[PDB]
Amino acid sequence: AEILKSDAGTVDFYGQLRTELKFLEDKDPTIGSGSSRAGVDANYTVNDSLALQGKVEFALKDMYVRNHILGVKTNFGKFSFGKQWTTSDDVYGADYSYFFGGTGLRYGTLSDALHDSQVKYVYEADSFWVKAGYGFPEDNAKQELAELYVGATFGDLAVHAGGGQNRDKAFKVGSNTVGTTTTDIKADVTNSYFEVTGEYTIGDALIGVTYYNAELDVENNPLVIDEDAISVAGTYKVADKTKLYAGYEYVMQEANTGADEDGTLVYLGVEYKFASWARVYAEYGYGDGTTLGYTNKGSDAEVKATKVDSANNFGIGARYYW
Ligand SMILES: CCCCCCCCOCCOCCOCCOCCO
Ligand SMILES: CCCCCCCCOCCOCCOCCOCCO
């Protein structure tokens, strides 16, 4: 990106402007959900064995801090402190969409993929890696979080596995009205999760599969909910500038009361790159059934718990990068 400074030190000014139109079943078109941002990333190498990083990223709305990081890289790994995305969000899984996928990735149900005071660790060797994180609860003002993932690449097959636990002692589930007493439903909820992923590259094709489990339990309550999830997705480079993509996502939710639900999400889309600094995309999404909540990494959208009936959805977008 825009190198302001460069030597043993570099200062990089970077960002994205986005314009996105969303057409959701039974709604008027929405313009302006596009997640634009701008930041600065400063790096300095002290020697062969030690480097420092300072990064800050703001949303372009009014303006507010998205990430704010101090980093220390050493021969025994990299340690990063401050307001960061979760390690679970960085590793992600087999969702290749720009708008509607991610329903089978179950790490974000409570956290929305962010904790304002974390320490994150990364170790890399050859093709092999370890990534971990911990969130400081601040005498209960912030959630509890602890995560660990490992992965490697063996020829054309890349694999990873891991997970964690995320606790929110006062999570807002929703609201109830009984006569004229309207009241918030809040609970002490823990989300415990684990996943395995494989991604296979063959020529112009990429195919991925992710399995996820999660367990939601409530501290002073017999209620437990288990989720079992599969995501099957791929991409295909049909020309130098042009990539097609598609996925199928199925999730079953089972409560210890015996209540069962499930949800299906299918997407198909196309990406076109004008240049390294410009691209556009268009996507169709078909949803049926239930989600307890998910995050689409591509667009940064959060979808709260919901049920839909045979819903047809479309998105179109364009981005500028520097
Ligand atoms: C006991 C925990 C061990 C988990 C580590 C990885 C297990 C092997 O992973 C291979 C990656 O598989 C991705 C998931 O689905 C593969 C099943 O489908 C095979 C046909 O595509
Ligand atoms: C490892 C590659 C898997 C191939 C895709 C199938 C995944 C389907 O999940 C099994 C659980 O299904 C229960 C409901 O299935 C409804 C009809 O499914 C259409 C098959 O894609």
Side-chain angles (χ1 to χ4, degrees):
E2 177 70 45
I3 47 152
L4 179 102
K5 216 264 165 216
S6 192
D7 185 18
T10 46
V11 180
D12 294 310
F13 285 77
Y14 69 94
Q16 298 181 38
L17 307 174
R18 307 190 175 185
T19 300
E20 291 182 332
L21 295 89
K22 289 177 76 174
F23 306 76
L24 302 183
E25 196 69 86
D26 292 338
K27 280 156 201 176
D28 305 318
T30 253
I31 71 178
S33 57
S35 193
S36 299
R37 81 276 314 265
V40 54
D41 190 11
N43 293 274
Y44 185 87
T45 296
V46 177
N47 61 31
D48 311 66
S49 289
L50 175 65
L52 303 170
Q53 175 191 29
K55 183 172 174 174
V56 58
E57 189 173 288
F58 301 93
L60 284 190
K61 316 189 76 272
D62 206 48
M63 275 198 11
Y64 80 90
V65 179
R66 278 167 61 84
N67 270 197
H68 185 183
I69 303 174
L70 211 167
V72 185
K73 182 157 190 286
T74 75
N75 291 330
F76 44 104
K78 180 181 192 174
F79 302 79
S80 296
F81 306 82
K83 180 178 194 186
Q84 293 174 94
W85 308 124
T86 66
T87 298
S88 51
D89 194 63
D90 293 345
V91 165
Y92 207 55
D95 162 37
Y96 304 134
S97 71
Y98 275 94
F99 293 102
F100 301 119
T103 60
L105 309 177
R106 307 312 304 137
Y107 58 90
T109 313
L110 312 179
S111 64
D112 297 342
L114 167 67
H115 193 291
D116 292 357
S117 179
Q118 290 180 81
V119 198
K120 287 174 57 191
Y121 179 74
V122 176
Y123 182 80
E124 295 179 73
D126 304 300
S127 323
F128 165 82
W129 56 264
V130 181
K131 302 181 183 186
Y134 173 83
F136 294 90
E138 275 166 358
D139 303 303
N140 294 352
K142 291 179 171 47
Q143 299 173 349
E144 305 181 8
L145 181 71
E147 300 189 317
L148 171 67
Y149 292 81
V150 61
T153 303
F154 309 101
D156 297 322
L157 180 62
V159 66
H160 57 81
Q165 194 173 267
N166 179 211
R167 188 166 170 190
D168 188 318
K169 285 167 179 190
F171 188 76
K172 185 167 204 262
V173 167
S175 50
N176 220 72
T177 312
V178 174
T180 69
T181 308
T182 289
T183 179
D184 283 348
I185 311 156
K186 309 213 177 207
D188 183 350
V189 53
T190 298
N191 186 25
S192 303
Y193 46 86
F194 178 72
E195 68 84 27
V196 175
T197 294
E199 294 174 285
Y200 194 62
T201 297
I202 25 163
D204 289 322
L206 167 66
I207 302 183
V209 178
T210 300
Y211 297 165
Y212 242 102
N213 274 334
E215 182 161 282
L216 292 160
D217 37 64
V218 187
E219 172 62 7
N220 264 118
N221 199 297
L223 184 68
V224 178
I225 296 168
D226 284 345
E227 297 181 307
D228 300 339
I230 184 176
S231 304
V232 189
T235 72
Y236 200 93
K237 184 159 207 205
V238 298
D240 38 54
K241 294 162 162 297
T242 302
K243 180 166 87 183
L244 302 190
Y245 61 87
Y248 170 78
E249 302 173 349
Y250 178 73
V251 181
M252 58 204 349
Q253 307 90 8
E254 172 173 312
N256 63 349
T257 66
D260 272 319
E261 306 272 1
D262 63 26
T264 296
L265 184 294
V266 177
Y267 61 80
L268 177 53
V270 56
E271 173 198 278
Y272 177 86
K273 289 181 181 191
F274 285 91
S276 67
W277 40 265
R279 70 180 67 169
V280 296
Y281 36 91
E283 189 173 303
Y284 167 60
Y286 171 82
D288 192 47
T290 295
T291 179
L292 308 178
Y294 77 97
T295 142
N296 176 253
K297 190 171 177 185
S299 69
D300 263 36
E302 298 285 10
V303 172
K304 294 302 217 158
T306 196
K307 196 278 178 215
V308 308
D309 176 15
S310 280
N312 295 297
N313 306 281
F314 307 80
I316 57 175
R319 292 176 185 187
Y320 178 76
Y321 292 80
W322 68 95

